Design a binder for this molecule. Structure first.
Ligand code: HEM
Ligand SMILES: *[C@@H]1O[C@H](CO)[C@@H](O[C@@H]2O[C@H](CO)[C@@H](O[C@H]3O[C@H](CO)[C@@H](O)[C@H](O)[C@@H]3O)[C@H](O)[C@H]2NC(C)=O)[C@H](O)[C@H]1NC(C)=O
Ligand SMILES: *[C@@H]1O[C@H](CO)[C@@H](O[C@@H]2O[C@H](CO)[C@@H](O[C@H]3O[C@H](CO)[C@@H](O)[C@H](O)[C@@H]3O)[C@H](O)[C@H]2NC(C)=O)[C@H](O)[C@H]1NC(C)=O
Ligand SMILES: *[C@@H]1O[C@H](CO)[C@@H](O[C@@H]2O[C@H](CO)[C@@H](O)[C@H](O)[C@H]2NC(C)=O)[C@H](O)[C@H]1NC(C)=O
Ligand SMILES: *[C@@H]1O[C@H](CO)[C@@H](O[C@@H]2O[C@H](CO)[C@@H](O)[C@H](O)[C@H]2NC(C)=O)[C@H](O)[C@H]1NC(C)=O
Ligand SMILES: O=C(NO)c1ccccc1O
Ligand SMILES: [Ca+2]
Length: 595
């Protein structure tokens, strides 16, 4: 008895069987268990959920119920005390480009999305929550502590709505509350193509048999494409500058316009698909609209996989890479490919990697204009700066020439995210990503820090002094202990990120284990992994290994001067070579001799 059945409210169809292409929803990857890894199903639970009432209510909800004998500290107070800092000087990662951060967010968005609860196409709930901070039903407000500046100017709380959950919607019961993953668990470029058949089609250009994705018709970038605008009104990207009135972009994933540099990455990817389809039609004139689409799509998925596993992961995991992701040995049908609930919090390490400004660079990589460098907070949901202020190139050069923020125990998340975050629903630039992440841990029913330490076979400190040794920091450990009273209560997000970094990596031991495990699984459990014998031909594989993020830029923008290794810190002009010197993807193994 597993309650095993609930496969209700989720989209279902029938398995093409022997079809050489992924489904849009991720169904039919695993043959014996077709829904494994599919969009719109519960996040997997590596450990049982820990809720206040065993079942659904998050810790902190009832002001008199403790966690292990103690009150859990307010999310925003953990924010003020531990996460914040004032001095941006000295914070840059000396050996990671701004693209390091940016790629993490692309990968993250391909793997997981736990959307908020609605129950309001119009309702006094999406206003009884913001207006009066009344806790109730899915309103779980972030209360301001005594002495928080935002009291004086903003109000009593920050509104926060609980994440969606499987089986039904309305008030629910029985089992413990399981959050939804609205995206496919496979590294499959679902952020470009969509996770629903509904959206996947909208995204496509079905006016012509060329297998192209829809492109914006109102605006161009030197004869290069943009993403289509979104139908949706109200539009937050419009609300950001009512004079300019530029809507958000329409991509395979809904978060695409969250910040300008993410919209930039999205548009590079769309551009690549269309390029692939054209080139492909040249070699194979007989091919379908659909065949063009799927074949370009499959190449792109292979790209996202290769860069992620070859270029990106080795420099997050560092020396722990070998211990968690051993060399590939083939598809294993017994490996569970689903994204775990804790992964969506472990992968939030990238929040501590966001710097406070974004730069635009000209063709010599010099400050583009008099306002080249901008505070990150003016760029949330900002599309007008792309369309009406130089297009994509000045913004991509910044990604190569500037650095990520480095995680630092005394300087965690920049005030740009910690004080001035803009939420697409509400109206001010006054939210706090750090406090939200913490509130969300509780919302998702996360075991505490020592549960995960235990899970990863690592020591579980019980005392101040134990915590000082693990964190290798007396002061940090003291603050944590004063807010939390015992390490068993430390929220996973703040606990995992407070750990010193492993050698040659950018996360600590606990994070390396959680991430490493997840990635091993999503590679080993993927029937369509690129190296899986029979998915691509040997000659096709040889062609795919030559792919690089540098090339992507050469083929898709008017940048002519790029680094070879784009994720490490690169200085212009020494570290920058001409595009000619950069290996090209050879599409000739994709030829199809008729007779
Ligand atoms: C300026 C850059 C970024 C902004 C503004 C941003 C903003 C946000 C916001 C508002 C959320 C939702 C919080 C919640 O409701 O719980 C979120 C979630 C998340 N973020 Fe970030 N983020 C950024 C960069 C990154 C980076 C660099 C990474 C990783 C390298 C990352 C990983 C994640 C992940 C994994 C989630 C959970 C998504 C889910 O499963 O629902 N983000 N981010
Ligand atoms: C800045 O970061 C660089 C990013 O990797 C780093 O250089 C790299 O160092 C690692 C080992 O420390 C090596 O990487 C690779 O190792 C072998 C080559 O012997 C390959 O077979 C592996 O697949 C893997 O890619 C490289 O030697 C080197 N990687 C690159 C891309 O050049 C620098 O050391 C960092 N700078 C400093 C001083 O911290
Ligand atoms: C809202 O978005 C507006 C862009 O649609 C933006 O206004 C634009 O920005 C500057 C003025 O600050 C102008 O840029 C330059 O234009 C000419 C060159 O042709 C110069 O002579 C000007 O002096 C100026 O430097 C844009 O022309 C201007 N466009 C319009 C129609 O106003 C606003 O800054 C945005 N506001 C916010 C709050 O972000
Ligand atoms: C769908 O694809 C078609 C075919 O490329 C696009 O229409 C072309 O647009 C360019 C620029 O205007 C012109 O060469 C022609 O007007 C069209 N070509 C042909 C073959 O007629 C169209 O823009 C795409 N539709 C969308 C919404 O992206
Ligand atoms: C595929 O991965 C599965 C899941 O981890 C492996 O299942 C294991 O089977 C081995 C023996 O082959 C046992 O030693 C492990 O204890 C099993 N794991 C669990 C917890 O079930 C399996 O090793 C892999 N299959 C192959 C043949 O590579
Ligand atoms: O940018 C985001 N994540 O990185 C994001 C933005 C809005 C809503 C949910 C999200 O996950
Ligand atoms: Ca996916």
């Amino acid at each position: 008895s597993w309650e095993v059945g609930c496969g209700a409210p989720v989209p279902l169809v029938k398995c093409d069987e022997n079809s050489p292409y992924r489904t849009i929803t991720g169904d039919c990857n695993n043959r014996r268990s077709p829904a494994l890894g599919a969009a719109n199903r519960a996040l997997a639970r590596w450990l049982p959920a820990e809720y206040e009432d065993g079942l659904a209510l998050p810790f902190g909800w009832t002001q008199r119920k403790t966690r292990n004998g103690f009150r859990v500290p307010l999310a925003r107070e953990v924010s003020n005390k531990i996460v914040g800092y004032l001095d941006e000087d000295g914070v840059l990662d000396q050996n990671r480009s701004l693209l390091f951060m940016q790629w993490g967010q692309i990968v993250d968005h391909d793997l997981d999305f736990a959307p908020e609860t609605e129950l309001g196409s119009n309702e006094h709930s999406k206003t009884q929550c913001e207006e009066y901070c009344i806790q109730g039903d899915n309103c779980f407000p972030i209360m301001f502590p005594k002495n928080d500046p935002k009291l004086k100017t903003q109000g009593k709380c920050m509104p926060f709505f609980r994440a969606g959950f499987v089986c039904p919607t309305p008030p629910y019961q029985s089992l413990a509350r399981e959050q939804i993953n609205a995206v496919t668990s496979f590294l499959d470029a679902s952020l470009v193509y969509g996770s629903e058949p509904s959206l996947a089609s909208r995204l496509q250009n079905l006016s012509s048999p060329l297998g192209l994705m829809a492109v914006n018709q109102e605006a161009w970038d030197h004869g290069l494409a943009y993403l289509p605008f979104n139908n949706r009104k109200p539009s937050p990207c419009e609300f950001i500058n009512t004079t300019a009135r530029v809507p958000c972009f329409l991509a395979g994933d809904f978060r695409a316009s969250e910040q300008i540099l993410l919209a930039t990455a999205h548009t590079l990817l769309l551009r690549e698909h269309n390029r692939l389809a054209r080139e492909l039609k040249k070699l194979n004139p007989q091919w379908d609209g659909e065949k063009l689409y799927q074949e370009a799509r499959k190449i792109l998925g292979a790209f996202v996989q290769i860069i992620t596993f070859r270029d990106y992961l080795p420099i997050v995991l560092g020396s722990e890479m070998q211990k968690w992701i051993p060399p590939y040995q083939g598809y294993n049908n017994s490996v569970d490919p689903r994204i775990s609930n804790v992964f969506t919090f472990a992968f939030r390490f990238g929040h501590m990697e966001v710097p406070s400004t974004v730069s635009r660079l000209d063709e010599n990589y010099q400050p583009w204009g008099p306002e080249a460098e901008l505070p990150l907070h003016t760029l949330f949901f900002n599309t007008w700066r792309i369309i009406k202020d130089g297009g994509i190139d000045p913004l991509v050069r910044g990604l190569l020439a500037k650095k990520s923020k480095l995680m630092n125990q005394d300087k965690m998340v920049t005030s740009e995210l910690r004080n001035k975050l803009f939420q697409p629903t509400h109206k001010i630039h006054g939210f706090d990503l750090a406090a939200i992440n913490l509130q969300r841990c509780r919302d998702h029913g996360m075991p505490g820090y020592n549960s995960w330490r235990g899970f990863c076979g690592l020591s579980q400190p019980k005392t101040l002094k134990g915590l000082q040794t693990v964190l290798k920091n007396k002061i940090l450990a003291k603050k944590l202990m004063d807010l939390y009273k015992t390490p068993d209560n430390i929220d996973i997000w703040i606990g995992g990120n407070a750990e010193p970094m492993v050698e040659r990596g950018r996360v600590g031991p606990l994070l390396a284990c959680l991430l490493g495990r997840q990635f091993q699984q999503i590679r080993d459990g993927d029937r369509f992994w690129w190296e899986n014998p029979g998915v691509f031909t040997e000659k096709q594989r040889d062609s795919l290994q030559k792919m690089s993020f540098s090339r992507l830029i050469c083929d898709n923008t008017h940048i002519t001067k790029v680094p070879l290794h784009a994720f490490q810190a690169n200085n212009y002009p020494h570290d920058f070579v001409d595009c000619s010197a950069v290996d090209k993807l050879d599409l000739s193994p994709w030829a199809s001799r008729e007779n």
